[PDB]
Amino acid sequence: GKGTPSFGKRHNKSHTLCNRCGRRSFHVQKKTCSSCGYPAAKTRSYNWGAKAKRRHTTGTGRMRYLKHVSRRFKNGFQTGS
Amino acid sequence: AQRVTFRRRNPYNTRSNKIKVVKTPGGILRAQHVKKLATRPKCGDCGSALQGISTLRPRQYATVSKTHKTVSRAYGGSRCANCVKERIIRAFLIEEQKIVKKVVKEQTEAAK
Amino acid sequence: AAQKSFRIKQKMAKAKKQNRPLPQWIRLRTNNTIRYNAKRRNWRRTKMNI
RNA sequence: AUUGGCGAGAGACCGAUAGCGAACAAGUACAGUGAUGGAAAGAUGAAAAGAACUUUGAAAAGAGAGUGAAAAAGUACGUG
RNA sequence: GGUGAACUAUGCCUGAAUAGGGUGAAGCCAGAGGAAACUCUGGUGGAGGCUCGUAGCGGUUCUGACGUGCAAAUCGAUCGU
RNA sequence: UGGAGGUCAGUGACGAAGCCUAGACCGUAAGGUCGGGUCGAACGGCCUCUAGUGCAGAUCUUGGUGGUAGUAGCAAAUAUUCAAAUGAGAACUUUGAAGACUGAAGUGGGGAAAGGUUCCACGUCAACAGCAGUUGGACGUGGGUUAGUCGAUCCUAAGAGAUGGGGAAGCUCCGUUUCAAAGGCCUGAUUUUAUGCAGGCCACCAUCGAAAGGGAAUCCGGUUAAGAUUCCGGAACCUGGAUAUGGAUUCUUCACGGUAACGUAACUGAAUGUGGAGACGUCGGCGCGAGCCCUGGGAGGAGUUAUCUUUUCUUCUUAACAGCUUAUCACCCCGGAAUUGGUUUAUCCGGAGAUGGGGUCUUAUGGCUGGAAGAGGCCAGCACCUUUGCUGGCUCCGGUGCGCUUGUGACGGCCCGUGAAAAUCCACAGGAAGGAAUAGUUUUCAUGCCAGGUCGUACUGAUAACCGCAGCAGGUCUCCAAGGUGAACAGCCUCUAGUUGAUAGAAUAAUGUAGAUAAGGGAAGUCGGCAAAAUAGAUCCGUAACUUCGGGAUAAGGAUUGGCUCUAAGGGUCGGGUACGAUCAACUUAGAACUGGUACGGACAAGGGGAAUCUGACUGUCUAAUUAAAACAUAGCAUUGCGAUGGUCAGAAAGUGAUGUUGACGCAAUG
RNA sequence: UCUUAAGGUAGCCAAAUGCCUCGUCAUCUAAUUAGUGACGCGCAUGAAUGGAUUAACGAGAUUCCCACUGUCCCUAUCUACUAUCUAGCGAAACCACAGCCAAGGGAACGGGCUUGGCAGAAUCAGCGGGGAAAGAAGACCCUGUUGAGCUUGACUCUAGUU
RNA sequence: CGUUGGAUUGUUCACCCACUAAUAGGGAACGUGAGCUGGGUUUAGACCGUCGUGAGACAGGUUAGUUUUACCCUACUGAUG
RNA sequence: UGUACAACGGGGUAUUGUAAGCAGUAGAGUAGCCUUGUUGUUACGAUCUGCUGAGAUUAAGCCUUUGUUGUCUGAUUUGU
RNA sequence: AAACUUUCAACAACGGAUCUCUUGGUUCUCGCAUCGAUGAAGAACGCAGCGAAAUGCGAUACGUAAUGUGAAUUGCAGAAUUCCGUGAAUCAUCGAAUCUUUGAACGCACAUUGCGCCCCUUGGUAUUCCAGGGGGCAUGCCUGUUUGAGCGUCAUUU
C-alpha cells in the first residue's frame, strides 16, 4: 500500500526551523531554507511569488528603526533638546 | 522472574550498550551496564600479548602506576621477551659480521 | 521527543503559555468585540509541526 | 516617468457573496515536508438601564416580575 | 523560475535482528576383505545463496470477506521464503 | 434597477425604506398604485444623463435547506455478572465479590523517532469520547522535569563545505590541498626597557557531519500526588589546577630482587622516532561464569483439610567501589623424545625441544573480607477521635543439569566477500637538563586541598498521547522474557504484571458472513477438483524410473504409539600385602508381562501421492493499489573498445569531473 | 539455371510457433475440438535473433491415475454474529415532476400522450423484473487543420565529435 | 403435458457414448452480470510465428489478469391494518 | 376459587452405560519377618469384581398438583 | 369520518436574503524624497497589577529621558495632595537614551542557547587553572603606519 500504510512511516523531519525566518523551512540535509534562502546573503524572493513577497516584506514586521525615519526626516534629522 | 530494563536512553543492543543482570541489596534484579572488555597490549613485532602488562582501556592506562604498564627489561612494555632476545642476538651478530666483512674487504684490497 | 534541543523546548514553552482562554476582564472592556480566544490550540486537534 | 514609500485632496466608483484576499486579534485561523495555498467573520439599545426579586426544576432553563420608546431589540440580539 | 529521496528506487557509512527440526559435504579415527592394487564397513565432524518450519519479510488462491469499508488497498484462511 | 444634473419650496420618527398579506384598482404585459400587519431613518413622481441595469436553467458560483430518513447502520479483536458507595440521574464512575483474557517475540516493564504537557492534583454539565457518563488523553485552575559520573557537548564515517585559485553576464559553479609567503608551548627575556628578542621543536595541512559508531568517571537504600543512576543518607570514582606529610639514593648520583618468563608501593624526564590499545565479520560445536529455572534440610507467614498429604504457595537479598586470592591460552628453567608420544567433541603439536617436573603472566570470571546489616525483606508485640512512633526474633547451610538466556574463552568452517576510520590514552631506544652531607630527586607510591559550567530529563511510544482528515482492525526501530506439555521464544493452559476496553436489551424468520456435519455414490459438478476433504508427529521396515552420482526421498508403500508393574544398559569422587564395595536416585534407550468398548502423535499440532507433457536450469527480482509469470536477474558462454596525451560517461565553463585508492586475471559496452 | 549472397545443415514439430485443422495414425475413454506417442513440402520450425536434450527446483501452464471428499445426484441440519423488534445515536448515494398495465402511434422499446384494462387510506419484512436505476462530459469508433509518449531513409535544426 | 445423463471444446453450433415415450424448433433488449460465473473476448505484464529498418502490427496461437451500490418507487412474494 | 393456573418433587417415558464411597484370599509385579514356610503380613499398584441395567439427565415444543407451595379485580376504548 | 398527503393564511421555527447603515476598499489628482556594518528589512523569545496576537516596547521591556498641553486613565483595582502645578494622561510631540537572541550578521560554529583566543578588574594563599565583571578578535578593497621578503635590482668589497 502506497497510501495509509506508507503514511504510517513518516517520522523524519526533512525541514526544521530556520534561523533567519522561523518557518520550518530549513532543509536539514541541504542546509538551506526553502523560504528565505538561508544561509545565503540574499533573502529568497521571486517575481512570480507576489503573495510570498507580500508575506515577507518591509512593514510586515515591527520596523523597529524604519518606522521613525519619516518623523526624523520631517524634523530635518535634528539633534539637541 | 523479575524483568529488567535499560538504565540509559539507548534502547539498542549496541556494543556500547551491554547489560548484565545483578541482584541488589533491595532484593530485586537490576540491569547493570558493563563496559567493553579491555584488549591485551600486543608486541610490536610478534603481535603477541605482553605479559606483566595490565589490560585497561587506553584512558584507564593513565591512572595506573608505571610498573603495571611495562617490564623491568629493556623494551619492557613494548616488545616481547623473545623479541628483545632475538633483536639483541641479531644486532650483535650482524655487527660482528660487519666488522668481519670490513676486515676481509680491506685485506683483499690490500692484497690486490 | 525527550531528548530535545533548547530551541524546540523554548517553542514548547511559548506555545504552552499562549494556550490559555481569554481573560474575563478584556471581555468587559469597552468597544471590545473579542469574546473568546480564537487562536486556541489542543495537542490532539492541530499540531504545531515544528 | 513613477500599481513602492511618506503626506494631502477628491470621485456620476463598490457598499460586507460587493469593494483589496483581508471594513473584524487578515496574510490572521488552518492545509502542505516544502515551494506555497489561504478563508469565514460588520449592525442590541440613546444609554446595559445586560433582566433585582418570587416560584418550578438537580441544573440548563421555564413561568411571573423588572429595565427599556420597543424584549415583535435578551447578548443564540437592527426588520428578520 | 523554483520545492521535494519523511513514501519509494539505487549506491554508500554506521548499527541492530533472524526458535526448533531434516539431510549430512570436506577434514579425522578405527575396523574388515584382498597376493597386491585397492575396495568396503562403522564412527567422528558439521558444509550448503540445501531443506521442514517460528519471529520476520512477502503476497498465490479463495477471483472469500468488505467494497457509500476498520482501511483511497484493509480483514480472514490458505500460501512463498 | 443602481447612481447623476434639474424640478416637484415632493413623502416621511403624527413613521421613510424594506418585508408579509387565496384584500382592492389600473395596464394586453413588463409592471404601477393603494388597504391591513411588521419596523425604525430615509425615500419617491416628472424632464433628462449614465451603466458593473432585469435570470430558471450554464454537471453555473457561494451560502442555506430538503425528501430519502428516525432509514443504512452503531455485528472483527471469546465476556461479562452480584452488591455497596457517590450521585438529580449509573449497563458504562469507584470499591469489594465472582467469572475471564493477554499467557514473558504479552493486552507486562522501559525506551528510539514523533508528539508537547497528553504527566499529577483539585471542581460539574456546554461541547467532544458516533449509547451513556457522576468518568476522561475533554473543560477550568494549578503543581511538576534538580546530574562533574546518564546523554548532548569531543572525534571521525559515508559525505557536506569556506579559504587559495580557476570558471560564469550573474544568481553562483568547481575545488578541499590543490601552480598559496597558509601556525602554535617552555624558560632566559618577566620593570633605570617590553611580551620587544642571534631563546628551541618544528610543519596538524579549515570546519561541519552519529542523543545506535569511538568515548573519563556512581552505586545501593530511602523519599514525591507527580522528578530521580539527577533529590536525601551512606559509600566511591574521573578530569583539571603551585608548595605540602609520609615512604624510596648520598665514603655506587636517576632502586632493588629473580637463572628466566617476570616481581614490587615508589624508583628522573625533552626533541626526535617507534609500538600498542581505540580497532571491529559471520556461522558451528565445546568449556567456564552471571542471572533465571529445578531441588534438599531448616527458620517464618498464608490455602483447603466430611478422606489424604514431614503437604501446596510465598521471605531467607547483598550494588558500584577497595584489598587479597583465583586463568584456559601464552611464556620461562631442568631435560633429552621411535616401541613415536601428548592430546580435542572437533590428526593439532613436538630436536625450531614433545611428555614429565618446577615455575612466570593477563584477572574474562569466581571466592573471601571491607562496603554491610546499621540497609532491604519476612515475622510478633504497646495510646485507640489529636497532623502518629517504638521494641523483640530471623534474615542459615546446601545440591543439580545436553536446562533457558546472556557474557566470556580456546577453537574450527566461510569468502574472486578476509569484515576500512579519527579523536584520545599509554609505552618503548635518548640523557639533551641535578644533586653527593640539617639538604639535592620523587605529585606515574600513599595521604591530604578545591572545582567541575551549559542544554535535555515529566509522560505516551500506540486497537486512544506518533502518521494515516479520527480516540482509524492500517503503518512505525529496539531491550528484559516464569511454569507444564512439547523438538520447539510455534499451538494450547497457568503464576508476576496488566486489562476486563469495542453502544445495549429481547427474540431466534428468510437471505447472508464465519464454522461444521452428512446415508449411498464419488468429480457424474465445473473452463478447470475452484472450495473442502483426505494425509500429517515420532519409532521401525521398505523405497522405483531417472540422474549432472550430489539427489530423486518424508519417493511410493506398510506396521506401531495409552496406562501400569517391572527389567537391562548407559557416569563423576575414594584403597590395598603389615582379583572389589560406598549417604550416590542427574535423563536417554531397548525389552517384558499385565491392563482397557481395537484406545492411545486421543485436544493442540501436523506432507496427500503418483505417471507424464509445455516452460524457466537453480536460490533471487518486479508492475505499492487487478498481471509473481514462461517476464527480469543469475552463474556460465561469446563478442566489442581501450596501454593513460587512453576507452566509456559527466560538465555552461573551469587550473572541473566518475570509473580511478583503477591498469588488460582491468575497466567500459553488448548479446 | 534465375532472383538477391546463399539456399534451412544438424536437429525439432499441428510445439506456447500449423491457417487448412476438430490434420492423419496409434494410445488413453462407453464416448475425448482435451492429453501423450508418432508422421511431416513446416500458411510461417531451426541453430548465442541460439537448436536439441536435460537431473534438481517451481504459490508457472496442461493431461491422466489412486486416495479423498456436499463440487454434484439433492439437498438437509446445527452453532456464533447479523438481518429482525426496542432505548439511545444517526448519515449517504440519488432526486425535472413522479411512480399500475396492454396495444397504438411516436426520435422506429412510454410513468405521462390516444384507445382500452382498471382504479380504495396507512403500511411491515423480503426481493432483485422494471425505473433503457446509480457510479464517470465513452477509455472502443469517427471527426478536430487538438495533443502527448515512442520510432525512423519524414521535414527543419542541434549538443557533442571530427 | 413432457422433451434427459454424459466424453471433448470458453464455445453458440458441432460430434460421439447412452438412456428415453421423445431426446422438436424458437422468442421474451440475439430473456436473464445491483442473479451468479468470468472459461472466452476485451486494457495494461509476457512468449512465439509471420510481417516491419524501427517503434510496432496481426478476428494468428499461448500464459497471468479488481465483476461496485438497492435502504427509494413500482412489480412480485408473504404480513398487518 | 376451579377437582383453574403455575413453581418444585414421585411416576411413566426416553438417553447413556454399571455413579461416589466402601469391601474383595481379585490383579502383572517390585522390597523382608521368624513362631523354621498348603490365608499369617506391610509401601504400594493401571485395571477387575460386588453393592450397580447403577448413577446422571429427562420438556426447555411429552401429565397430576391424591405431595408441598403460591396466583386470581392492573390500564384504554367501543353509539344501532 | 380520522391519521396521512397536498394548498393557503396566522403565530411560532435553523436560515441569514432584503432594506438602511459604514473608522474599509478602489480609482484619480497634488506635494515630498527619507532604509542599512553608527547594524537595516525580517525572525525568535520575552515585557502590563490582573494579557498571547499588524498595540507598543526590549532585562531602563505596554516603556525611560526632553518638550508641549493642562487633569486624567478607566474593565476592575491601586503607590500618591499626582491638581493656582517643573504637573495626570493607553495624551501629543520627540531631538536624549535603553534597545534581549538573531538577521547582510562579523572570533570559529550553529538541527548545539556548542567551542575558542586576546586585554584589564575581582575571588579562589594564581602570568599559566577555574570562576565572575567589562572590552574585543569576519571578509574583499582603498589611503596611510610599521615590520619584512625576493641576485628583481642601485652606491663599499682579496
UniProtKB/Swiss-Prot annotation, chain A:
PANTHER family: 60S RIBOSOMAL PROTEIN L37, RIBOSOMAL PROTEIN L37. Its main location: cytoplasm. It is found in: Cytoplasm. It comes from the Eukaryota. Gene3D superfamilies: 2.20.25.30. A zinc finger (C4-type) spans 18-36. It comes from Saccharomyces cerevisiae (strain ATCC 204508 / S288c) (Baker's yeast). This is Large ribosomal subunit protein eL37A. Belongs to the eukaryotic ribosomal protein eL37 family. Keywords: Cytoplasm, Metal-binding, Ribonucleoprotein, Ribosomal protein, RNA-binding, rRNA-binding, Zinc, Zinc-finger. HAMAP family: Ribosomal_eL37. Binds 1 zinc ion per subunit. GO terms for molecular function: RNA binding; rRNA binding; structural constituent of ribosome; zinc ion binding. Component of the large ribosomal subunit (LSU). Mature yeast ribosomes consist of a small (40S) and a large (60S) subunit. The 40S small subunit contains 1 molecule of ribosomal RNA (18S rRNA) and 33 different proteins (encoded by 57 genes). The large 60S subunit contains 3 rRNA molecules (25S, 5.8S and 5S rRNA) and 46 different proteins (encoded by 81 genes). Zn(2+) binds at C18, C21, C33, C36. SUPFAM superfamilies: Zn-binding ribosomal proteins. InterPro entries: Ribosomal_eL37, Ribosomal_eL37/eL43, Ribosomal_eL37_CS, Ribosomal_zn-bd. Component of the ribosome, a large ribonucleoprotein complex responsible for the synthesis of proteins in the cell. The small ribosomal subunit (SSU) binds messenger RNAs (mRNAs) and translates the encoded message by selecting cognate aminoacyl-transfer RNA (tRNA) molecules. The large subunit (LSU) contains the ribosomal catalytic site termed the peptidyl transferase center (PTC), which catalyzes the formation of peptide bonds, thereby polymerizing the amino acids delivered by tRNAs into a polypeptide chain. One of its GO terms (cellular component) is cytosolic large ribosomal subunit. GO terms for biological process: cleavage in ITS2 between 5.8S rRNA and LSU-rRNA of tricistronic rRNA transcript (SSU-rRNA, 5.8S rRNA, LSU-rRNA); cytoplasmic translation. Disulfide bonds: none annotated.
From Swiss-Prot, chain B:
It is found in: Cytoplasm. One of its GO terms (molecular function) is structural constituent of ribosome. Keywords: Cytoplasm, Ribonucleoprotein, Ribosomal protein. GO terms for biological process: cytoplasmic translation; ribosome biogenesis. GO terms for cellular component: cytosol; cytosolic large ribosomal subunit; preribosome, large subunit precursor. Pfam families: Ribosomal_L34e (PF01199). InterPro entries: Ribosomal_eL34 (IPR008195), Ribosomal_eL34_C_sf (IPR038562), Ribosomal_eL34_CS (IPR018065). Coiled coil: none annotated. Its main location: cytoplasm. Present with 23600 molecules/cell in log phase SD medium. There are 2 genes for eL34 in yeast. Component of the ribosome, a large ribonucleoprotein complex responsible for the synthesis of proteins in the cell. The small ribosomal subunit (SSU) binds messenger RNAs (mRNAs) and translates the encoded message by selecting cognate aminoacyl-transfer RNA (tRNA) molecules. The large subunit (LSU) contains the ribosomal catalytic site termed the peptidyl transferase center (PTC), which catalyzes the formation of peptide bonds, thereby polymerizing the amino acids delivered by tRNAs into a polypeptide chain. Component of the large ribosomal subunit (LSU). Mature yeast ribosomes consist of a small (40S) and a large (60S) subunit. The 40S small subunit contains 1 molecule of ribosomal RNA (18S rRNA) and 33 different proteins (encoded by 57 genes). The large 60S subunit contains 3 rRNA molecules (25S, 5.8S and 5S rRNA) and 46 different proteins (encoded by 81 genes). Belongs to the eukaryotic ribosomal protein eL34 family. This is Large ribosomal subunit protein eL34A.
Curated annotation (Swiss-Prot), chain C:
Residues 1-21 are annotated as: Disordered. Pfam families: Ribosomal_L39 (PF00832). GO terms for molecular function: structural constituent of ribosome. InterPro entries: Ribosomal_eL39, Ribosomal_eL39_CS, Ribosomal_eL39_dom_sf. Its main location: cytoplasm. Keywords: Cytoplasm, Ribonucleoprotein, Ribosomal protein. It is found in: Cytoplasm. Residues 6-19 have a biased composition (Basic residues). Component of the ribosome, a large ribonucleoprotein complex responsible for the synthesis of proteins in the cell. The small ribosomal subunit (SSU) binds messenger RNAs (mRNAs) and translates the encoded message by selecting cognate aminoacyl-transfer RNA (tRNA) molecules. The large subunit (LSU) contains the ribosomal catalytic site termed the peptidyl transferase center (PTC), which catalyzes the formation of peptide bonds, thereby polymerizing the amino acids delivered by tRNAs into a polypeptide chain. Component of the large ribosomal subunit (LSU). Mature yeast ribosomes consist of a small (40S) and a large (60S) subunit. The 40S small subunit contains 1 molecule of ribosomal RNA (18S rRNA) and 33 different proteins (encoded by 57 genes). The large 60S subunit contains 3 rRNA molecules (25S, 5.8S and 5S rRNA) and 46 different proteins (encoded by 81 genes). eL39 interacts with YIH1. This is Large ribosomal subunit protein eL39. It comes from Saccharomyces cerevisiae (strain ATCC 204508 / S288c) (Baker's yeast).
